[PDB]
Design a protein around this ligand. Structure first.
Ligand code: AGS
Ligand code: AGS
Ligand code: AGS
Ligand code: ADP
Ligand code: MG
Ligand code: MG
Ligand code: MG
Lengths: 328, 643, 319, 348
């Protein structure tokens, strides 16, 4: 029966998304003419691209025709682009007559909101280009991505491009305070600030983690322990213990440290992320930073490949220990 | 309309990065001018033999050797000598009880050797003895029941017996399930009504055409009754239904399983099912007596194939049919058909081998089986080619084509026979001079490590021809692996790639050949100095020899360097112990094996230890005392040791 | 008046004109001479002469009764489940009078395209009816054939034709067709057809119909491969560890429109017969295969090609 | 029904450790809109016990009455594949990684069957059927993309409970929606208390120091501790202070292989270690386990300088094994490279 939090407090219409000035202005200009061009939104996640395009779809159409006249699709389908093209062809072939009692008839074009458009190979991108050219005046395409450089020349040239700069910490802290006071959750500022810090500037992960914490510990305060164990973030004491173990130069306590990390159920990818984030912002030499970062990249490739966690972390910590103790 | 697709960016004033300028440092302003001048190809012509194995001289008279072999029929003395030679090769074979039978079978041919040497009697079958005696006893009891029914009819005018009306037979392909059924039926005079997969067998057709075969008599009971009506729709003899390949169900065969279940319920005549799918024993719901055909012993079938060769008046050796059976996984049908094709083509190689344990031997069957004679000269031998140093271009091409022909089958040829192919001694399992000896051992070990590093590189970072672990996971796993082939006529419609198959095959073959050539050359130059160490008085040959099992020395070459019978008995052990009722709900699979199985083996070994001590009888009853219903054979298997 | 293609104009009509795979063709010759052919499955690369071999064997076995006692099913026919159930079984049950030792032949070309249900049905109708009919099937990848048919057949292996054989039959066609040529054109045609007689004959007919003279320039103007002298100069620069000239020539190749796949294919084909040391050849082959799997997996840019160039250069300058 | 199963807790109040975690899970299911649960932690931490506990707190008592069914489905390459499944009228549990790289069917079509079964079944209790995909870490990237789109599409009909030992191979859009349940391995005193409770419920009185030795030998694996306690109960009726902890038999086989490699350095010993490793692989033990065991066994004998090099070598060849197909090449090549490193290290 209920809905998740992320789709609940998204803005209902345009002009309600803060921190954006010209994107919403051009969107309102396009909506006043009742004609949305082929649209491309690029920006880091948790910024409001999906919220903006869904608000524009709700504004131009009616809410009873909002779901019937839009189609959300993802480009990471496992069966190639044949299934995606057949779904787009089926959606564009089907036409649903609509009527609005507000006074404005619905525009004839249908909306295909396609997410993760930057994970697309060039052959599939050209196929999508020819699909969009086949339905130029009957279906206006929406492409969602973080990196516009991955989209090849023809689709990028024929689309209205909009950049979404991620929100500041104060704005998302205020929005999370509004969420907390709206949903009757007892909240201190420190918890919301730590949520913003562990979400890494993504409002979607912050909202999801807040809803997860307030449903995991119902009718109770939201401490830092629950947020840390829900976001998956390794405690900083563990990271400092890793750094001290590598600085010691003893392999036995190194093995004990990684065994403690593994037996605590801590993910190796998160340990690698935190280790890299601490290594690159320290007073280490550029040679040490270079070798440590190269080993971090190789180990992260091994992890995404799917090798053993314990051996990968042992090797990365051995490289870090040798690099740090070489100067000693 | 052509509206403006404006790139809109929230470019705020500042940030020192929106409006950037080219760097003023001298390195990035010293752009080298691009040159497009390549060499001209019109002046340089491609000489003959540059990119190929083209040579000016051509061999004439060495090839195109027609055989024109007119084999003289063997006399009694030479035949008896071959019989005693095979008897000394296989002392556990009753070779006297079969030779009049095949001699009578042989006494301008239009038969395949599968049907020319078709076993008329079940005693003429080879291997699977318990299964065929079980089937023969079951069908003899059915004959006794039919004769008793006829006696009761002539006079007129069943838990203790436990005669279940159906045997279900399961085993590998070509072990002789249909041969066993037919041999038993002809020996006891039954009449088989066969339902094949080649025929349309839908439920209404099979019941309305074959129910009265079971429910009623035979109108023709004397005369021609050893004939086999294959059912299709476009002394007295008793009926016997047989379903060949029951596991093969199409969409046209609508309701076949319900039909044979009605046949199960309402029969008065024997019903036999034959299938090679091991999973069909689980899916089918009914009461049936189970018979399993195991894979027959390699030496017995090898002696029988040598025997079929003898009755066609050729002599040969045991080992070549051993590796022939190994390549075909002891499939008797495939081996018999290839043996017929091979014998009737006049033979491959005429080499004499005087053995006592006389005509010339006909070794070289497995070489032509893999197509290696189309690559090599008839004077060339495989291991002779592999042991010596490869220098010429044509020898390199022969090596690459051999490895390519073995790479499409995902078989590592040089890896499996690595002991017998390296220039090192191989024996069956039953001070400055020392510094130089250890240095030689170190050099040999470094070469071996380098080669095996390239082999790991080849498996990991090179594409394989056939995509490994496609339907099951990797080898030695107890999840599944009974992946039956397809059963629908609809096409695959897949989007697989084709180029990266023969491209990767050439790549892997070339890399494996070059790595093995490097390793063998390094080992050769390492042991070129072994004579100096032998003169010094110290012999490191005990540390250089290779210890390999007896079963891998019985073949000329192996497609695998492990033991598959070992793996089969293991996989049977884990599947049988973890099919018990209580332990059937352990879901975490890896955890289940590495935690439950060694502790269970420890429990079994401790239980056997307390039983050998003449202790109380109740110490046997821990397994039954926790309601852990494990069969005693597997408990005895778990209680032996860890290999 | 019609120009019959030289593939079909000069197809062999006897089994003694087949070049390549001497042992299997000799056994097919003796089986056509004597008779009682087993159910054969001939597997090999495309173009090596499998269809021609089985057609010549069927012709020499049958003779005047080839129109009646032979049934041919190619991939362009139906070959469905009902076809295997009705038509093949009916031909097997058909009564045809033939001399002693001769059986009816049901040729089933491209058994790879035979669906697994049709194979599952074809098992028993291959097994029982062997007294009157025989089966001659042909494929490329024998793994696509289900294990029961391979159990029910004899598996004959066809290999890639050695370059001497394709040269000899190319010279036979040339001396029968008065083709003006040089030896450079011979080497270019043999290069463009890697053990493929059909590709060699088609390329030869195409360049003779296009330009009328057989040299290397015309052949690579019709076949339009990346030129093997350019790839040889690539490999020769990388032997000397000159990344600048090698990347110059590869940038030239890339700007001509050659794809990554045939570029790395041509690099491997030239590098296989290149004149260098064995260890350097092994490391070059290993790095070429690694880069080729990278192209296979989906990443195929100039950066990967130049990276392979850098690795090949550095394998020489590093011990 | 061993002590790992007879005395397995089925209620959320029975969990003696992770009491705050159990209370949080109970409070989550009191809301009635719990999301997909990605539960991770090392093997033997109790993930299966926790998901059965939250299943019993979620549904009625009928989730104990389970059944075993085999499902056979068609590959897109038109082949039939069969796979076991532990299921009930309330929940269905299917391991999807038994299909090799063809896990995408066992992900998608099986979820289609659960969706249509939930559309057919009605019991007025809850509006979803829990689908439990144990060992989701071993799924391929293509299968995990299929998993992602299926959770995006099938969320209102079924709820997904994924169990894994690591979220490394798990693609990040999967973890962006699933609630993370980190279940760490319980501490030494937790194992001692669980062993004491189990032995007291079995009518025996074990000492504290034997339970502590068993907890230290088990390496924070509760199931291994329970099984070793059961084996010790087999060995001796009283829990003596000199009770020998039953060592894992393939573990001491691996230790003997470690003494075999470290003892003699010759290609003959390399072939003997190869044969022993083949014998150990034929027991269906996964190759990463022998990799980790070999690392832990040979790191005792090496000095402090060689440990980092052997560690990096082990990680590199473990990744080569995971990328590869036959584990024997990568494993034995690690044996060979370690053999060469050892021989060139003790010679100087
Ligand atoms: N500036 C903003 N104004 C209003 N809501 C915002 C703003 N930034 C983020 N949000 C909210 O943050 C949540 C997540 O943003 P979405 O638009 O759904 O996803 P996203 O920003 O496109 O990132 P993705 O989809 O992962 S690439 C939604 O509930 C939005 O309403
Ligand atoms: N044990 C055996 N002894 C002697 N000949 C055998 C034996 N097994 C098979 N054959 C020969 O192989 C021929 C065919 O065997 P089949 O019984 O048809 O094989 P199968 O057991 O039916 O397996 P399928 O039908 O291919 S799944 C027989 O006619 C015999 O010539
Ligand atoms: N060994 C050969 N000797 C002589 N001519 C050959 C040979 N192989 C191929 N040819 C020629 O190439 C033509 C086509 O050969 P095919 O037999 O059709 O190829 P294939 O062996 O059937 O492989 P496919 O059909 O591509 S699967 C023949 O008509 C001949 O002209
Ligand atoms: N609170 C508890 N009290 C006693 N025993 C437990 C408790 N939690 C788990 N166990 C036992 O520990 C073992 C852990 O195995 P399992 O549940 O499969 O976890 P995992 O899936 O992490 O291996 C179970 O067999 C169970 O009997
Ligand atoms: Mg979105
Ligand atoms: Mg059969
Ligand atoms: Mg053909």
């Amino acid at each position: 029966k209920p809905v998740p939090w992320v789709e609940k407090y998204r803005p209902k219409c345009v002009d309600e998304v803060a921190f954006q000035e010209e994107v919403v202005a051009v969107l309102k200009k396009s909506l006043e003419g009742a004609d949305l061009p082929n649209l491309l939104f690029y920006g880091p996640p948790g910024t409001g691209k999906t919220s903006t395009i869904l608000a524009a779809a709700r504004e131009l159409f009616g809410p009873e025709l909002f779901r019937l006249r839009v189609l959300e699709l993802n480009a990471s389908d496992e069966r190639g682009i044949q299934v995606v093209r057949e779904k787009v062809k089926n959606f564009a072939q089907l036409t649903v007559s609509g009527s609005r009692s507000d006074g404005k008839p619905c525009p004839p074009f249908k909306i295909v909101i396609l997410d993760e458009a930057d994970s697309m190979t060039s052959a599939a991108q050209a196929a999508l280009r020819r699909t969009m050219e086949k339905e130029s005046k009957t279906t206006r395409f929406c492409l969602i991505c973080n990196y516009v450089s991955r989209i090849i020349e023809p689709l990028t040239s024929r689309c209205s491009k909009f950049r979404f700069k991620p929100l500041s910490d104060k704005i998302q802290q205020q929005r999370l305070l509004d969420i907390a006071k709206k949903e009757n959750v007892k909240i201190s500022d420190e918890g919301i600030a730590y949520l913003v810090k562990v979400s890494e500037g993504d409002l979607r992960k912050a909202i999801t983690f807040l809803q997860s914490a307030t449903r995991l510990t119902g009718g109770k305060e939201i401490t830092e322990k629950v947020i840390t164990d829900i976001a998956g973030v390794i405690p900083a004491e563990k990271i400092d213990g890793v750094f001290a173990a590598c600085q010691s130069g003893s392999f036995d306590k190194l093995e004990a440290v990684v065994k403690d990390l593994i037996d605590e159920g801590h993910a190796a990818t998160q340990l690698v992320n935190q280790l890299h984030d601490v290594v690159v912002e320290n007073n280490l030499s550029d040679k040490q930073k270079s070798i440590i970062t190269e080993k971090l990249a190789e180990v992260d490739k091994c992890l995404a490949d799917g090798a053993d966690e314990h051996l990968q972390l042992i090797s990365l910590c051995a490289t870090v220990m040798q690099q740090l103790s070489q100067n000693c | 309309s052509f509206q403006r697709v404006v790139h809109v960016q929230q470019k705020d004033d500042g940030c020192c990065l929106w409006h950037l300028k080219p760097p003023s440092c001298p390195l990035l302003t010293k752009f080298k001018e691009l040159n497009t001048k390549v060499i001209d190809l019109s002046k340089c012509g491609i000489a003959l033999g540059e990119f190929s194995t083209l040579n000016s001289k051509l061999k004439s008279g060495n090839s195109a050797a027609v055989f024109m072999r007119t084999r003289k029929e063997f006399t009694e003395e030479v035949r008896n000598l071959l019989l005693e030679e095979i008897r000394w090769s296989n002392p556990e074979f009753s070779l006297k009880k079969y030779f009049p039978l095949l001699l009578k079978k042989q006494i301008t041919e239009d038969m395949l050797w599968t049907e020319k040497y078709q076993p008329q009697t079940a005693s003429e079958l080879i291997g699977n003895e318990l299964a065929i005696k079980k089937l023969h006893s079951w069908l003899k009891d059915w004959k006794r029941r039919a004769e008793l029914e006829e006696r009761q009819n002539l006079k007129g005018k069943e838990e203790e017996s436990r005669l279940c009306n159906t045997v279900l037979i399961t085993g590998p392909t070509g072990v002789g399930k249909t041969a066993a059924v037919y041999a038993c039926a002809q020996e006891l005079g039954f009449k088989i009504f066969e339902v094949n997969a080649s025929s349309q067998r839908s439920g209404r057709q099979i019941l309305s055409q074959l129910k009265e075969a079971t429910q009623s008599h035979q109108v023709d009971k004397q005369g021609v009754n050893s004939q086999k009506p294959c059912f299709f729709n476009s002394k007295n003899a008793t009926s016997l239904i047989l379903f060949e390949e029951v596991d093969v169900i199409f969409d046209e065969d609508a309701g076949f399983l319900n039909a044979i279940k009605t046949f199960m319920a309402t029969t008065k005549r024997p019903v036999i099912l034959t299938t090679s799918d091991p999973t069909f024993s689980l899916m089918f719901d009914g009461c049936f007596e189970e018979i399993k055909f195991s894979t027959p012993s390699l030496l017995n079938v090898a002696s029988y194939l040598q025997m079929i060769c003898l009755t066609e008046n050729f002599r040969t050796d045991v080992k070549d049919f051993v590796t022939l059976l190994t390549a075909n996984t002891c499939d008797i049908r495939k081996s018999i058909l290839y043996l017929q094709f091979w014998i009737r083509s006049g033979g491959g190689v005429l080499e004499e081998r005087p053995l006592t344990l006389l005509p010339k031997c006909d070794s070289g069957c497995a070489e032509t089986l893999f197509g290696l004679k189309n690559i090599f000269s008839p004077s060339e031998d495989l291991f002779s080619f592999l042991k010596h140093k490869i220098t010429m271009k044509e020898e390199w091409h022969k090596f690459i084509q051999l490895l390519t022909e073995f790479q499409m089958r995902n078989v590592d040829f040089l890896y499996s026979n690595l002991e017998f192919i390296l220039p090192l001694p191989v024996d069956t399992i039953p001070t400055t001079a020392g510094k130089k000896c250890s240095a030689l051992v170190s050099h040999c070990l470094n070469s071996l490590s380098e080669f095996m590093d390239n082999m790991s590189f080849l498996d990991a970072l090179l594409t394989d021809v056939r995509e490994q672990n496609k339907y099951g996971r990797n080898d030695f796993s107890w999840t599944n692996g009974k992946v039956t082939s397809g059963l629908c006529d609809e096409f695959s419609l897949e989007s697989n790639d084709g180029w990266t198959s023969q491209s990767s095959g050439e790549l892997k073959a070339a890399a494996e050949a070059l790595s093995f050539t490097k390793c063998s050359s390094a080992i050769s130059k390492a042991l070129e100095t072994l004579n100096s160490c032998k003169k010094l008085g110290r012999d490191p040959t005990n540390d250089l020899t290779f210890y390999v099992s007896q079963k891998r020395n019985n073949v000329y070459f192996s497609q695998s360097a492990a033991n598959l019978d070992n793996a089969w008995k293991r996989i049977s052990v884990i599947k049988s112990v973890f099919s018990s009722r209580s332990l059937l709900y352990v879901g975490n699979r890896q955890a289940s094996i590495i935690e439950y199985l060694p502790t269970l083996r420890n429990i079994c070994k401790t239980e056997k230890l307390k039983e050998q001590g003449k202790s109380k009888r109740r110490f046997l009853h821990y397994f039954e005392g926790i309601h852990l219903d494990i069969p005693k054979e597997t408990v005895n298997t778990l209680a032996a040791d860890f290999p | 008046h019609y120009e019959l293609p030289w593939v079909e104009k000069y197809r062999p009509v006897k089994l003694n004109e087949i070049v390549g795979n001497e042992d299997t063709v000799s056994r097919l010759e003796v089986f056509a001479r004597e008779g009682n052919v087993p159910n054969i499955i001939i597997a090999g690369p495309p173009g090596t002469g499998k269809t021609t071999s089985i057609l010549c064997l069927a012709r020499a076995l049958l003779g005047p009764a080839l129109k009646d006692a032979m049934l041919e099913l190619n991939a362009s026919n139906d070959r469905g489940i009902d076809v295997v159930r009705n038509k093949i079984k009916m031909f097997a049950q058909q009564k045809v009078t033939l001399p002693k030792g001769r059986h009816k032949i049901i040729i089933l070309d491209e058994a790879d395209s035979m669906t697994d249900g049709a194979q599952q049905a074809l098992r028993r109708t291959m097994e029982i009816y062997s007294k009157t009919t025989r089966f001659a099937l042909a494929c490329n990848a024998s793994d696509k054939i289900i294990e029961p048919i391979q159990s029910r057949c004899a598996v004959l292996r066809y290999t890639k034709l050695t370059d001497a054989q394709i040269l000899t039959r190319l010279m036979n066609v040339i001396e029968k067709e008065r083709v003006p040529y040089t030896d450079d054109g011979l080497e270019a045609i043999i290069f463009t057809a890697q053990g493929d007689m059909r590709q060699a004959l088609n390329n030869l007919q195409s360049t003779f119909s296009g330009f009328g003279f057989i040299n290397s320039e015309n052949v690579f103007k019709v076949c339009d491969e990346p030129h093997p002298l350019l790839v040889k100069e690539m490999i020769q620069h990388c032997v000397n560890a000159n990344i600048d000239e090698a990347y110059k020539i590869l940038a030239h190749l890339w700007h001509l429109g050659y794809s990554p796949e045939d570029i790395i294919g041509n690099i491997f084909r030239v590098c296989k017969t290149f004149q260098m040391a064995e260890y350097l050849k092994l490391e070059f082959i290993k790095e070429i295969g690694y880069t080729h799997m990278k192209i296979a997996e989906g990443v195929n840019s100039l950066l990967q090609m130049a990276g392979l160039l850098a690795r090949l250069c550095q394998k020489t300058m590093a011990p | 029904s061993l002590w790992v199963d007879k005395y397995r807790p089925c209620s959320l109040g029975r969990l003696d450790y992770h009491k705050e975690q159990a209370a949080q899970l109970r409070n989550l299911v009191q809301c009635g809109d719990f999301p997909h649960l990605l539960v991770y932690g090392p093997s033997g931490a109790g993930k299966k016990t926790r998901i059965m506990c939250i299943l019993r707190e979620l549904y009625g008592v009928g989730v104990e009455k389970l059944r075993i069914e085999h499902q056979t489905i068609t590959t897109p390459s038109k082949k039939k594949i069969e796979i076991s499944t532990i299921a009930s009228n309330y929940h269905l549990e299917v391991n999807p990684s038994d299909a090799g790289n063809s896990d995408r069917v066992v992900i998608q079509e099986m979820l289609k069957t659960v969706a249509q079964s939930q559309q057919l079944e009605t019991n007025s209790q809850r509006d979803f059927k829990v689908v439990l995909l144990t060992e989701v870490d071993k799924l391929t990237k293509d299968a995990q993309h299929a998993l992602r789109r299926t959770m995006e599409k099938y969320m209102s009909t079924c709820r997904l409970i994924l169990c894994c030992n690591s979220t490394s191979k798990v693609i990040p859009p999967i973890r962006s929606r699933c609630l993370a349940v980190r279940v760490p391995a319980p501490s030494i005193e937790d194992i001692c208390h669980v062993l004491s409770t189990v032995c007291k419920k079995e009518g025996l009185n074990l000492p504290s120091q034997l339970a502590h030795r068993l907890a230290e030998k088990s390496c924070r694996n509760l199931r291994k501790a329970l099984l070793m306690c059961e084996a010790c109960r087999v060995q001796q009726y009283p829990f003596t202070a000199d009770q020998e902890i039953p060592e894992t038999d393939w573990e001491v086989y691996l230790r003997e292989t470690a003494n075999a490699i470290v003892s003699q350095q010759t290609p003959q010993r390399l072939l003997e270690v190869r044969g022993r490793l083949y014998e150990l692989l034929t027991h269906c033990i996964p190759p990463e386990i022998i990799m980790k065991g070999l690392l832990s066994e040979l790191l005792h004998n090496c000095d402090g300088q060689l440990k980092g090099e052997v560690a990096q070598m082990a990680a590199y060849y473990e990744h080569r094994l995971q990328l590869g197909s036959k584990a024997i090449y990568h494993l034995e090549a690690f044996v060979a490279k370690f053999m060469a490193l050892y021989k060139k290290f003790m010679e100087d």
